[PDB]
DNA sequence: TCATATCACCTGCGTTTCCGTTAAACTATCGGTTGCGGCCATATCTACCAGAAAGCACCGTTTCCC
């Protein structure tokens, strides 16, 4: 009833409602998925970055079935300096699919920046 | 012949979560081997010392001199 409510709202653009009526579930269950899949919405319109990572990251844990999401996660996470959660979010793409090559020369980057060389070693072989 | 509810079950499939595996960069000692220097032995040089034959000075019995 009340991720209707709140979806409701959304729909209704009364974003400030919306996340009122998430947070009444979100209070209960904090990786509560089902409520992410607008209120990131919402976060990430208001810039609520940071906050919005974590949305994805701690219920996505458990979430894990949106995939391709996963490139998303990994990328805003290495934005905000989250770079263990970076390569974590990374390893669940080539995990459920190694043909999202482009995440494996992403993920590369992160190895390059801190000498991580020989997890990246290997994938570029693969890559060529 | 498909579409719900409820109970015994028990045995079965193959699912679903934290731990285990192969092997990573970076980590904490600690070992096969590197170079570097004490105690003690020797022949020589020396400091500190006493003893003898000989110096040498303090002394007063002598007697010549005030």
Avoid at 53 to 58: D, E, I, Y
Wanted: proline share 1%.
């Amino acid at each position: 009833q009340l991720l209707s409510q709140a979806n409701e709202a959304f729909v209704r653009n009364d974003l400030q409602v919306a996340e009122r009526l998430f947070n009444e579930v979100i209070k209960k269950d904090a990786r509560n998925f089902a409520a992410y899949e607008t209120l990131g919405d919402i976060y990430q319109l208001q810039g609520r970055l940071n906050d919005c990572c974590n949305s994805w990251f701690l219920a996505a844990h458990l979430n894990a079935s949106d995939w391709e999401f996963w490139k998303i996660v990994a990328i805003l996470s290495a934005d905000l300096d989250h770079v263990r959660q970076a390569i974590y979010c990374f390893s669940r793409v080539i995990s459920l699919n190694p043909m999202e090559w482009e995440s494996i020369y992403r993920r590369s980057m992160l190895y390059k920046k801190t000498g991580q060389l020989a997890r990246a070693l290997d994938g570029f072989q693969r890559l060529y």
